[PDB]
Coordinates of C-alpha atoms and ligand atoms in Angstrom, one line a residue:
Chain B
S1 CA -0.1 -0.1 -0.2
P2 CA 1.9 2.9 -1.4
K3 CA 1.6 6.3 0.1
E4 CA 2.3 8.4 -2.9
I5 CA -1.1 7.5 -4.5
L6 CA -2.7 9.0 -1.4
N7 CA -0.9 12.2 -2.0
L8 CA -1.6 12.2 -5.8
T9 CA -5.3 11.7 -5.0
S10 CA -5.3 14.6 -2.3
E11 CA -3.7 16.9 -4.9
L12 CA -6.2 15.9 -7.6
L13 CA -9.0 16.8 -5.2
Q14 CA -7.6 19.9 -4.1
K15 CA -7.1 21.0 -7.9
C16 CA -10.5 19.9 -9.2
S17 CA -12.5 21.2 -6.1
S18 CA -12.2 24.7 -7.2
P19 CA -15.2 26.0 -9.6
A20 CA -15.2 26.4 -13.4
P21 CA -12.2 28.8 -14.0
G22 CA -14.1 30.3 -17.1
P23 CA -13.6 30.4 -20.7
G24 CA -10.1 29.9 -22.5
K25 CA -8.6 28.4 -19.3
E26 CA -11.1 25.2 -19.1
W27 CA -8.6 23.6 -21.7
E28 CA -5.6 24.5 -19.5
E29 CA -7.3 23.0 -16.6
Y30 CA -8.5 20.2 -18.4
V31 CA -4.7 19.3 -19.5
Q32 CA -3.6 19.8 -15.8
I33 CA -6.1 17.3 -14.5
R34 CA -5.3 15.0 -17.2
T35 CA -1.6 15.0 -16.5
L36 CA -2.4 14.1 -13.0
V37 CA -4.8 11.4 -14.0
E38 CA -2.1 9.9 -16.5
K39 CA 0.7 10.0 -13.9
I40 CA -1.4 8.0 -11.4
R41 CA -2.6 5.6 -14.1
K42 CA 0.8 4.6 -15.1
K43 CA 1.9 4.6 -11.4
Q44 CA -0.8 1.9 -10.9
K45 CA -1.2 -1.9 -12.3
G46 CA -4.4 -0.9 -13.9
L47 CA -7.1 -3.9 -14.0
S48 CA -6.8 -5.3 -10.3
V49 CA -8.6 -8.5 -11.5
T50 CA -8.0 -9.7 -15.3
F51 CA -9.4 -12.8 -16.8
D52 CA -6.9 -15.2 -18.3
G53 CA -9.0 -15.7 -21.3
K54 CA -10.9 -13.5 -23.7
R55 CA -14.4 -11.9 -23.7
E56 CA -15.6 -14.2 -26.2
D57 CA -14.6 -17.3 -24.0
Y58 CA -17.3 -16.6 -21.3
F59 CA -20.5 -16.4 -23.3
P60 CA -21.2 -20.1 -22.7
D61 CA -20.8 -19.5 -19.0
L62 CA -23.5 -16.9 -19.3
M63 CA -25.7 -19.2 -21.1
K64 CA -25.3 -21.9 -18.6
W65 CA -25.7 -19.6 -15.6
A66 CA -28.7 -17.9 -16.8
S67 CA -30.4 -21.1 -17.9
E68 CA -30.1 -22.5 -14.4
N69 CA -32.3 -19.4 -13.1
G70 CA -34.8 -19.3 -15.5
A71 CA -33.4 -16.4 -17.9
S72 CA -34.2 -17.0 -21.5
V73 CA -31.0 -18.3 -23.4
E74 CA -32.9 -19.4 -26.8
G75 CA -33.7 -17.6 -29.7
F76 CA -30.4 -15.8 -30.0
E77 CA -26.5 -16.3 -30.0
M78 CA -23.5 -14.1 -29.4
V79 CA -21.3 -12.6 -32.2
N80 CA -19.0 -9.9 -32.6
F81 CA -20.5 -7.5 -35.2
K82 CA -17.9 -5.2 -36.6
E83 CA -19.6 -2.0 -36.6
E84 CA -20.7 -2.0 -33.0
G85 CA -18.8 -4.7 -31.5
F86 CA -20.4 -7.7 -29.7
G87 CA -23.9 -8.1 -29.5
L88 CA -26.9 -10.7 -30.0
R89 CA -27.6 -12.4 -33.4
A90 CA -30.9 -14.2 -33.5
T91 CA -31.0 -17.8 -34.1
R92 CA -34.7 -17.9 -35.5
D93 CA -37.3 -15.7 -36.9
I94 CA -38.6 -13.2 -34.5
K95 CA -41.8 -11.3 -35.2
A96 CA -42.7 -7.8 -34.1
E97 CA -43.8 -7.6 -30.2
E98 CA -42.5 -11.2 -29.8
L99 CA -41.1 -11.7 -26.3
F100 CA -37.9 -13.6 -26.7
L101 CA -36.3 -12.0 -23.1
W102 CA -36.6 -12.4 -19.6
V103 CA -34.5 -12.2 -16.6
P104 CA -35.7 -13.1 -13.2
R105 CA -34.5 -10.1 -10.6
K106 CA -32.4 -12.4 -8.7
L107 CA -30.1 -12.2 -11.5
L108 CA -30.3 -8.5 -11.8
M109 CA -27.8 -6.3 -10.0
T110 CA -29.6 -3.3 -8.1
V111 CA -28.6 -0.7 -5.6
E112 CA -30.8 -2.5 -3.0
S113 CA -28.8 -5.8 -3.6
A114 CA -25.5 -3.5 -2.9
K115 CA -27.1 -2.6 0.5
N116 CA -27.5 -6.4 1.1
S117 CA -24.1 -7.0 -0.3
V118 CA -20.9 -6.7 1.9
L119 CA -20.9 -2.8 0.9
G120 CA -23.9 -2.5 3.2
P121 CA -21.8 -1.0 6.0
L122 CA -20.5 1.5 3.7
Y123 CA -23.8 2.4 2.0
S124 CA -25.1 2.9 5.4
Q125 CA -22.7 6.0 6.4
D126 CA -21.7 7.6 3.3
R127 CA -24.2 9.9 1.9
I128 CA -22.5 10.2 -1.5
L129 CA -23.7 6.5 -2.5
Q130 CA -27.0 7.3 -1.1
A131 CA -27.5 10.0 -3.5
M132 CA -26.7 8.7 -7.0
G133 CA -27.9 5.0 -7.8
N134 CA -25.4 4.6 -10.8
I135 CA -22.5 5.2 -8.2
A136 CA -23.5 2.6 -5.6
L137 CA -24.3 0.2 -8.4
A138 CA -20.8 0.9 -9.8
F139 CA -19.2 0.1 -6.5
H140 CA -21.3 -3.0 -6.1
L141 CA -19.9 -4.1 -9.7
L142 CA -16.4 -3.6 -8.5
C143 CA -16.8 -5.2 -5.2
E144 CA -18.5 -8.6 -6.8
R145 CA -15.6 -8.6 -9.5
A146 CA -13.0 -9.1 -6.8
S147 CA -14.7 -12.1 -5.4
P148 CA -14.4 -15.4 -7.2
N149 CA -17.5 -16.9 -5.1
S150 CA -19.7 -14.2 -6.7
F151 CA -23.1 -15.0 -7.7
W152 CA -22.9 -12.3 -10.6
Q153 CA -19.4 -13.3 -11.4
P154 CA -20.3 -14.8 -14.9
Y155 CA -21.7 -11.5 -15.7
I156 CA -18.7 -9.9 -15.1
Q157 CA -16.7 -12.4 -16.8
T158 CA -18.2 -10.9 -20.2
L159 CA -17.9 -7.4 -19.6
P160 CA -15.8 -5.3 -22.0
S161 CA -12.2 -4.4 -20.8
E162 CA -12.4 -0.9 -22.3
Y163 CA -15.0 1.4 -23.9
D164 CA -15.2 4.4 -26.2
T165 CA -16.4 6.8 -23.5
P166 CA -15.0 10.4 -23.3
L167 CA -12.9 9.0 -20.3
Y168 CA -10.9 6.9 -22.8
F169 CA -10.1 9.9 -25.1
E170 CA -6.7 11.1 -25.6
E171 CA -5.5 14.8 -25.8
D172 CA -5.7 14.9 -29.7
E173 CA -9.3 13.3 -29.7
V174 CA -10.5 16.0 -27.2
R175 CA -8.7 18.6 -29.5
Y176 CA -10.7 17.6 -32.3
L177 CA -13.8 18.4 -30.3
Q178 CA -12.5 22.0 -29.5
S179 CA -15.0 24.9 -30.1
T180 CA -18.1 22.6 -29.5
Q181 CA -20.6 22.7 -26.7
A182 CA -20.1 19.0 -26.0
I183 CA -16.4 19.7 -24.8
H184 CA -18.1 21.3 -21.7
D185 CA -19.8 18.4 -20.7
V186 CA -16.7 16.6 -21.2
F187 CA -15.1 18.7 -18.9
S188 CA -17.9 18.1 -16.4
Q189 CA -17.8 14.3 -16.5
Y190 CA -13.8 14.3 -16.2
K191 CA -13.8 16.5 -13.5
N192 CA -16.5 14.9 -11.5
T193 CA -14.8 11.4 -12.3
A194 CA -11.6 12.6 -10.9
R195 CA -13.1 14.1 -7.6
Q196 CA -15.3 11.0 -6.9
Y197 CA -12.1 8.6 -7.5
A198 CA -9.9 10.9 -5.2
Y199 CA -12.5 11.3 -2.2
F200 CA -13.6 7.5 -2.4
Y201 CA -10.0 6.1 -2.6
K202 CA -8.8 8.0 0.4
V203 CA -12.2 7.2 2.4
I204 CA -11.7 3.6 1.7
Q205 CA -8.2 3.8 3.0
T206 CA -9.4 5.6 6.3
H207 CA -13.2 4.4 6.7
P208 CA -12.7 1.2 9.2
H209 CA -16.1 -0.2 7.6
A210 CA -14.3 -1.0 4.3
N211 CA -11.8 -3.3 5.9
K212 CA -13.7 -6.3 4.7
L213 CA -14.1 -5.1 1.2
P214 CA -12.1 -6.5 -1.6
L215 CA -11.6 -3.1 -3.0
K216 CA -9.1 -1.9 -0.2
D217 CA -6.3 -4.1 -1.6
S218 CA -6.4 -2.8 -5.0
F219 CA -8.7 0.5 -6.0
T220 CA -7.0 1.6 -9.3
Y221 CA -7.9 4.6 -11.5
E222 CA -8.9 1.5 -14.4
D223 CA -10.9 -0.3 -12.1
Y224 CA -13.3 2.7 -11.1
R225 CA -13.2 4.3 -14.8
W226 CA -14.3 0.7 -16.3
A227 CA -17.0 0.2 -13.5
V228 CA -18.3 3.7 -14.0
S229 CA -18.2 3.5 -18.0
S230 CA -19.9 0.2 -17.8
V231 CA -22.9 1.2 -15.5
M232 CA -23.3 4.4 -17.5
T233 CA -23.4 2.5 -20.8
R234 CA -25.7 -0.3 -20.1
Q235 CA -27.8 0.8 -17.0
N236 CA -31.9 0.9 -17.1
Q237 CA -34.2 1.9 -14.4
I238 CA -36.2 -0.4 -12.3
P239 CA -38.6 -0.2 -9.3
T240 CA -37.5 -1.2 -5.9
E241 CA -38.6 -4.6 -4.4
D242 CA -41.4 -2.9 -2.5
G243 CA -42.7 -1.1 -5.4
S244 CA -42.5 2.3 -3.6
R245 CA -39.6 3.7 -5.7
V246 CA -37.6 3.1 -8.6
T247 CA -33.8 2.7 -9.0
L248 CA -31.0 2.0 -11.4
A249 CA -30.2 -1.4 -12.3
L250 CA -27.7 -3.5 -14.7
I251 CA -29.7 -6.2 -16.5
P252 CA -27.4 -9.0 -17.9
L253 CA -28.1 -10.2 -21.4
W254 CA -30.4 -7.5 -22.3
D255 CA -28.1 -4.4 -22.3
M256 CA -25.7 -6.4 -24.5
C257 CA -28.2 -5.5 -27.5
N258 CA -26.9 -2.4 -29.9
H259 CA -29.2 0.4 -30.8
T260 CA -31.4 1.5 -33.5
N261 CA -34.2 4.1 -34.2
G262 CA -37.6 3.0 -32.9
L263 CA -40.0 2.8 -29.7
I264 CA -38.8 1.6 -26.5
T265 CA -39.6 -2.0 -25.9
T266 CA -38.1 -2.9 -22.7
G267 CA -40.2 -3.1 -19.4
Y268 CA -40.0 -4.8 -16.1
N269 CA -42.8 -6.9 -14.7
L270 CA -43.1 -6.5 -11.1
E271 CA -45.8 -9.0 -10.8
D272 CA -43.4 -11.7 -11.9
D273 CA -40.4 -9.8 -10.5
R274 CA -38.7 -9.9 -13.9
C275 CA -37.7 -7.6 -16.8
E276 CA -39.4 -8.7 -20.4
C277 CA -38.6 -7.1 -23.7
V278 CA -40.5 -7.6 -26.9
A279 CA -39.0 -7.3 -30.2
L280 CA -38.6 -3.9 -31.6
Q281 CA -39.2 -5.1 -35.3
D282 CA -39.0 -8.1 -37.5
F283 CA -35.6 -9.6 -37.3
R284 CA -35.2 -12.3 -39.8
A285 CA -32.5 -15.3 -39.6
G286 CA -29.1 -13.7 -39.2
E287 CA -30.1 -10.3 -38.4
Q288 CA -28.9 -8.5 -35.5
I289 CA -31.0 -8.2 -32.3
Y290 CA -31.6 -4.3 -31.8
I291 CA -33.4 -2.3 -29.2
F292 CA -34.2 1.1 -28.3
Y293 CA -31.9 3.0 -25.9
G294 CA -33.9 6.0 -25.4
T295 CA -34.6 9.5 -26.7
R296 CA -31.2 11.0 -25.9
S297 CA -29.3 13.3 -28.5
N298 CA -26.1 12.1 -30.0
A299 CA -24.2 14.2 -27.5
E300 CA -25.5 12.1 -24.8
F301 CA -24.7 9.2 -26.8
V302 CA -21.2 9.9 -27.1
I303 CA -20.7 11.4 -23.9
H304 CA -22.3 8.4 -21.8
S305 CA -23.1 5.2 -24.2
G306 CA -19.9 5.7 -26.2
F307 CA -20.6 6.0 -29.7
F308 CA -22.3 8.1 -32.4
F309 CA -25.6 6.9 -34.3
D310 CA -26.1 8.4 -37.7
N311 CA -29.5 9.2 -39.0
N312 CA -30.6 10.1 -35.5
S313 CA -33.8 12.2 -35.6
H314 CA -34.1 13.0 -32.1
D315 CA -30.7 15.1 -31.9
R316 CA -30.5 18.7 -30.5
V317 CA -27.6 21.4 -29.5
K318 CA -27.9 23.2 -26.2
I319 CA -28.4 26.8 -26.7
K320 CA -27.8 29.3 -24.1
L321 CA -30.0 32.2 -24.1
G322 CA -31.5 34.9 -21.7
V323 CA -33.1 38.2 -21.2
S324 CA -30.3 40.9 -20.4
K325 CA -30.8 42.9 -17.1
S326 CA -30.5 45.9 -19.2
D327 CA -34.2 45.8 -21.1
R328 CA -36.9 48.2 -20.2
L329 CA -39.6 45.3 -20.2
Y330 CA -37.7 43.1 -17.6
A331 CA -40.3 44.1 -14.7
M332 CA -43.3 43.7 -16.8
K333 CA -42.0 40.6 -18.5
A334 CA -40.9 38.8 -15.1
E335 CA -44.9 38.6 -14.5
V336 CA -45.3 36.2 -17.7
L337 CA -42.0 34.2 -16.7
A338 CA -43.2 33.7 -13.3
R339 CA -46.6 32.6 -14.8
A340 CA -45.4 30.7 -17.8
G341 CA -43.0 28.6 -15.8
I342 CA -40.3 29.7 -17.8
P343 CA -37.1 30.6 -15.7
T344 CA -34.8 33.6 -16.0
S345 CA -32.4 31.8 -17.9
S346 CA -31.8 28.0 -18.8
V347 CA -30.5 25.9 -21.5
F348 CA -32.6 25.3 -24.6
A349 CA -32.5 22.8 -27.5
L350 CA -32.8 23.1 -31.3
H351 CA -34.3 20.0 -32.5
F352 CA -33.1 18.3 -35.8
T353 CA -36.8 16.8 -36.8
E354 CA -39.3 19.3 -37.7
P355 CA -40.5 21.9 -36.2
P356 CA -36.6 22.7 -35.3
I357 CA -38.1 24.9 -32.5
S358 CA -39.6 23.7 -29.3
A359 CA -42.6 24.9 -27.3
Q360 CA -40.6 26.2 -24.2
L361 CA -38.5 27.8 -27.0
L362 CA -41.2 29.5 -28.8
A363 CA -42.2 30.8 -25.6
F364 CA -38.9 32.2 -24.4
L365 CA -38.6 33.9 -27.8
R366 CA -42.1 35.4 -27.9
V367 CA -41.2 37.1 -24.6
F368 CA -37.7 38.1 -25.9
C369 CA -38.9 40.7 -28.7
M370 CA -42.6 41.2 -28.2
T371 CA -43.8 44.9 -27.6
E372 CA -45.1 46.6 -24.4
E373 CA -48.6 47.3 -25.8
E374 CA -49.1 43.5 -26.5
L375 CA -47.4 42.7 -23.2
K376 CA -50.8 43.2 -21.1
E377 CA -53.2 41.4 -23.6
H378 CA -52.1 38.1 -22.3
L379 CA -52.5 39.5 -18.7
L380 CA -56.0 41.0 -18.6
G381 CA -59.0 39.9 -20.4
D382 CA -61.2 36.8 -21.1
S383 CA -58.6 35.7 -23.4
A384 CA -55.8 36.0 -21.1
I385 CA -56.3 32.2 -19.9
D386 CA -56.4 31.3 -23.7
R387 CA -53.6 33.6 -24.6
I388 CA -51.3 32.0 -22.1
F389 CA -52.7 28.5 -22.9
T390 CA -52.0 28.9 -26.8
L391 CA -48.7 31.2 -26.2
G392 CA -46.7 27.9 -27.2
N393 CA -48.9 27.5 -30.4
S394 CA -47.0 27.8 -33.5
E395 CA -50.2 28.2 -35.5
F396 CA -51.4 30.9 -33.1
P397 CA -48.9 34.0 -33.5
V398 CA -49.5 36.5 -31.0
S399 CA -48.7 39.5 -33.4
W400 CA -47.0 39.5 -36.9
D401 CA -44.4 41.8 -35.8
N402 CA -43.2 39.7 -32.8
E403 CA -43.0 36.9 -35.4
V404 CA -40.8 38.8 -37.6
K405 CA -38.5 40.1 -35.1
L406 CA -38.3 36.6 -33.2
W407 CA -37.1 35.1 -36.4
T408 CA -34.8 37.9 -37.1
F409 CA -33.2 37.4 -33.6
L410 CA -33.0 33.7 -34.4
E411 CA -31.3 33.9 -37.6
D412 CA -28.8 36.5 -35.8
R413 CA -28.0 34.0 -33.1
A414 CA -27.9 31.1 -35.5
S415 CA -25.4 33.0 -37.7
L416 CA -23.3 33.8 -34.6
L417 CA -23.1 30.3 -33.6
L418 CA -22.1 29.3 -37.1
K419 CA -19.2 31.8 -36.8
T420 CA -18.0 30.8 -33.4
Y421 CA -16.9 27.5 -34.7
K422 CA -13.4 27.0 -35.5
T423 CA -13.8 25.0 -38.6
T424 CA -16.1 24.9 -41.5
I425 CA -18.5 22.1 -42.5
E426 CA -17.1 21.4 -45.9
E427 CA -13.7 20.6 -44.1
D428 CA -15.4 18.2 -41.9
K429 CA -17.0 16.3 -44.7
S430 CA -13.5 16.1 -46.3
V431 CA -11.7 15.0 -43.3
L432 CA -14.4 12.2 -43.0
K433 CA -14.1 11.0 -46.5
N434 CA -10.3 11.2 -46.8
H435 CA -8.6 10.8 -43.8
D436 CA -8.2 7.5 -41.7
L437 CA -8.8 8.2 -38.0
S438 CA -9.5 6.0 -35.0
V439 CA -13.0 5.1 -33.8
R440 CA -12.7 7.9 -31.1
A441 CA -11.9 10.7 -33.1
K442 CA -14.4 9.2 -35.7
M443 CA -17.5 10.1 -33.2
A444 CA -16.0 13.2 -31.9
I445 CA -15.7 14.8 -35.5
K446 CA -18.9 13.1 -36.6
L447 CA -20.5 14.8 -33.5
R448 CA -18.9 18.3 -34.4
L449 CA -20.4 17.8 -38.0
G450 CA -23.9 16.9 -36.8
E451 CA -24.2 19.9 -34.5
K452 CA -23.0 22.3 -37.5
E453 CA -25.6 20.5 -39.9
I454 CA -28.5 21.0 -37.1
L455 CA -27.4 24.6 -36.8
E456 CA -27.4 25.1 -40.8
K457 CA -30.8 23.4 -40.9
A458 CA -32.1 25.8 -38.3
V459 CA -30.5 28.8 -40.1
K460 CA -32.6 27.6 -43.2
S461 CA -35.7 26.9 -41.2
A462 CA -35.7 30.7 -39.6
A463 CA -35.1 32.0 -43.2
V464 CA -37.9 30.3 -44.9
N465 CA -40.2 31.2 -42.0
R466 CA -39.2 34.8 -42.0
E467 CA -39.8 35.2 -45.7
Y468 CA -43.1 33.4 -45.0
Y469 CA -44.2 36.0 -42.7
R470 CA -42.7 39.0 -44.8
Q471 CA -45.1 37.6 -47.7
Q472 CA -47.8 37.4 -45.0
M473 CA -47.1 41.1 -44.5
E474 CA -47.7 41.8 -48.2
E475 CA -50.8 39.7 -47.6
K476 CA -53.9 40.4 -45.3
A477 CA -55.3 37.7 -43.2
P478 CA -58.2 38.9 -40.5
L479 CA -57.5 36.2 -38.0
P480 CA -54.8 37.3 -35.7
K481 CA -54.7 34.0 -34.1
Chain O
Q1 CA -51.3 0.1 -8.2
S2 CA -54.4 1.4 -7.1
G3 CA -54.5 4.2 -9.6
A4 CA -54.3 6.9 -7.2
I5 CA -51.7 8.7 -4.9
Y6 CA -51.8 8.0 -1.1
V7 CA -49.9 10.7 1.0
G8 CA -50.6 12.5 4.4
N9 CA -54.5 12.7 4.8
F10 CA -55.2 13.3 1.1
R11 CA -55.9 11.5 -2.2
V12 CA -54.8 12.3 -5.6
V13 CA -56.5 10.7 -8.5
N14 CA -57.8 11.8 -12.3
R15 CA -61.0 13.8 -11.9
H16 CA -62.6 12.0 -15.0
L17 CA -62.6 8.6 -13.2
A18 CA -63.1 9.7 -9.6
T19 CA -66.0 8.3 -7.6
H20 CA -69.0 10.6 -6.0
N21 CA -67.2 9.7 -2.6
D22 CA -64.0 11.8 -3.6
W23 CA -66.3 14.8 -4.5
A24 CA -68.3 14.2 -1.1
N25 CA -64.6 14.9 0.6
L26 CA -63.7 17.5 -2.0
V27 CA -61.0 19.7 -0.4
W28 CA -59.6 21.3 -3.9
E29 CA -60.1 20.3 -7.7
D30 CA -59.2 21.6 -11.2
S31 CA -60.9 20.5 -14.4
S32 CA -58.0 22.0 -16.6
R33 CA -55.7 19.7 -14.7
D34 CA -58.1 16.6 -14.5
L35 CA -56.7 16.4 -11.1
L36 CA -58.6 15.6 -8.0
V37 CA -57.6 15.9 -4.4
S38 CA -59.7 14.5 -1.8
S39 CA -59.0 14.0 2.2
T40 CA -58.3 10.7 3.6
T41 CA -58.5 9.5 7.0
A42 CA -55.6 7.0 6.7
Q43 CA -52.1 8.1 6.1
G44 CA -50.5 7.7 2.8
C45 CA -47.1 5.8 2.1
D46 CA -46.3 7.6 -0.8
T47 CA -43.7 10.7 -1.0
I48 CA -43.9 13.6 -3.4
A49 CA -40.6 14.3 -5.3
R50 CA -39.7 18.2 -5.5
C51 CA -36.9 17.6 -8.1
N52 CA -36.7 18.0 -11.6
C53 CA -36.1 14.6 -13.3
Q54 CA -37.2 14.2 -17.1
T55 CA -37.0 10.5 -17.1
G56 CA -39.1 8.2 -15.0
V57 CA -41.0 4.9 -15.0
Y58 CA -44.8 4.7 -15.6
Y59 CA -47.3 2.0 -15.4
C60 CA -49.1 1.1 -18.6
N61 CA -52.5 -0.4 -17.0
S62 CA -53.3 -1.7 -20.8
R63 CA -49.9 -3.8 -20.4
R64 CA -50.1 -4.7 -16.7
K65 CA -46.5 -3.5 -16.9
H66 CA -44.4 -0.4 -16.0
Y67 CA -42.2 1.2 -18.7
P68 CA -39.4 3.9 -18.7
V69 CA -39.9 7.1 -20.7
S70 CA -38.4 10.4 -21.2
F71 CA -40.8 13.2 -21.1
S72 CA -40.9 16.8 -21.8
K73 CA -41.0 19.7 -19.2
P74 CA -44.7 20.8 -18.0
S75 CA -46.1 22.7 -20.5
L76 CA -49.4 23.5 -21.9
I77 CA -50.4 21.2 -24.9
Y78 CA -53.7 20.9 -27.1
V79 CA -55.5 17.9 -26.2
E80 CA -58.2 16.4 -28.6
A81 CA -61.6 15.9 -27.6
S82 CA -62.8 12.6 -26.4
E83 CA -65.7 10.9 -24.7
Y84 CA -64.9 12.4 -21.2
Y85 CA -63.2 15.7 -21.7
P86 CA -63.9 17.9 -24.7
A87 CA -61.0 19.8 -26.2
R88 CA -59.9 22.6 -24.0
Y89 CA -56.9 23.9 -22.5
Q90 CA -54.8 21.7 -20.6
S91 CA -52.1 23.0 -18.3
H92 CA -49.0 21.1 -16.5
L93 CA -49.3 18.4 -19.2
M94 CA -46.1 16.4 -19.5
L95 CA -45.9 14.9 -23.2
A96 CA -44.0 11.7 -24.1
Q97 CA -44.0 8.8 -26.2
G98 CA -45.8 5.7 -24.9
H99 CA -48.6 3.3 -24.9
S100 CA -51.8 4.9 -23.7
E101 CA -55.1 3.4 -24.5
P102 CA -58.7 4.1 -22.8
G103 CA -58.6 3.2 -19.2
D104 CA -54.7 3.4 -18.9
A105 CA -55.5 6.7 -16.8
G106 CA -54.3 6.4 -13.2
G107 CA -50.9 5.0 -13.8
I108 CA -48.2 6.6 -11.4
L109 CA -44.8 7.6 -13.2
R110 CA -42.1 7.4 -10.5
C111 CA -38.6 8.7 -10.7
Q112 CA -35.7 8.5 -8.0
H113 CA -37.0 11.2 -5.7
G114 CA -40.7 10.0 -5.5
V115 CA -44.0 10.7 -7.7
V116 CA -43.9 13.6 -10.2
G117 CA -47.1 13.5 -12.0
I118 CA -50.0 10.7 -13.2
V119 CA -50.9 9.6 -16.6
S120 CA -53.9 11.7 -18.0
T121 CA -54.1 11.6 -21.6
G122 CA -53.1 9.2 -24.4
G123 CA -53.6 8.7 -28.3
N124 CA -51.5 8.6 -31.4
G125 CA -48.7 7.3 -29.7
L126 CA -48.4 10.3 -27.1
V127 CA -48.7 9.9 -23.4
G128 CA -49.7 12.9 -21.2
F129 CA -48.7 13.1 -17.5
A130 CA -50.3 15.6 -15.3
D131 CA -47.8 17.3 -12.9
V132 CA -48.4 17.4 -9.3
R133 CA -45.1 18.8 -7.8
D134 CA -46.4 22.3 -8.3
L135 CA -49.1 22.0 -5.3
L136 CA -46.4 22.3 -2.2
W137 CA -49.7 22.7 0.1
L138 CA -49.9 18.6 -0.5
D139 CA -47.6 17.6 2.4
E140 CA -47.8 16.4 6.1
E141 CA -49.4 18.9 8.3
Ligands
LIG1 ZN1 -36.5 12.5 -9.5

């Protein structure tokens, strides 16, 4: 038990505990913390417990172990697909809605199970584990990994050694993401991971209740990083045993399926105390077994699941907007803000699918350029309740001048956002078609290209609607609404 | 899964499927929300979540299961006329994709911190949850 690692974690916690330094210097703070992370990583052995064989050699163990406990192991087989890695390949014809998967909870790994595990003494006193379910679940996975006589050890056997999450990025692969909004989320993720690792290694070394855990003998950055990455990439929500609350869970034999566009088809059957997944679509013989991971943007996909999906219709680019404190309509508009549920300032999303804008957006904008004379109509009158109800109705403009001003401001901000980026869309497409980059650089550059494409489409939509309203100005329509 | 929230000395359930006994013990109601609040003699075992999760789990009564779903923030959405409520303004309606057919109303959608709202509307592959976090008065006395 070397003492140098303790000082390294202490220094790391001290540095990362400070608030965000600001713009421009976030990069320098990132490289500083990455330097400390790298030095400690090469100061440790990495994976505390390593399986002698390869990942693909343990799948039959999963089949036998699950079959003994009533988890379906028929109708599919394990194959390493080149484009998404390991997955499930159907051994027969599966029709839509067909139920080919069910796993009893006994098999499932849950925060409650961790509370019933040897981690319970630590869970009792430490608040941090109490707050986030994923963190406690990750520590449960780590504790079970070092125990050869673990009921879930066959599950742990097949988990991949390394993933494609941002924590696996090198300085160049994060450099390719510079000037984009997602980099700030990468910053927050990496800083949180570092602070958690430092605090947790020091508590485990000092907390007496951790004496009996298998982690005390070896708690490296690689182990914690792998655990957090796995829980973050293959986690699903299930209710507590009593049914009072829901909690995070890792579902073996289900989360190993890849993602495709569609509708959620995974649900847990509390009455049977098991999780059942219905077929997302018709998977013929030899076709891959797909499921829907949720309605998350490609930015979240890259940050958490660890890959980028093409043709994703549910993508979005956070946009920071707000009303400056120097407008003469602040006091009168705050009444709507309070009554419209719209905060003073918050992060909004532009949607790739039509309509590009979102109700909460149409609302903030309608309140960002509207004139004063029209700012009391929604406050007084029998139509005030109807006006606030329809305040998000695109088909109901409050006024045509507010519309043209809104679309003007939208084009202005979108053009500013396009200018802000370091590179151009043409260069990105040429790099994708010409160069041969690694997978991680590949998804990073694809993410940047997708953000630029969504912004360009937003500019186009704003311009068409602005032209539409200008022609509507040349026209006469009696219905204001 | 009785189709209603039991907390404190109160009962929260959809207005359109409530019984006359609820109105006999009416303390507050709202037609625009399809939310009915009635007083209960017993003490409920459910806690109201005062957090802002946009992802939870809801019970699809038609399937006798519960599904995880990602829902939009509380906002006012047009609701098409049905056999029970004619099309009118409906506030505090969380909208998300899911299975919701007639009679599904009453399923509780649950996140980490507790109850957020209740399934109120369905159709066209869309599911509407009515918020209950706003009314802070709904707590122990
Ligand atoms: Zn919550």
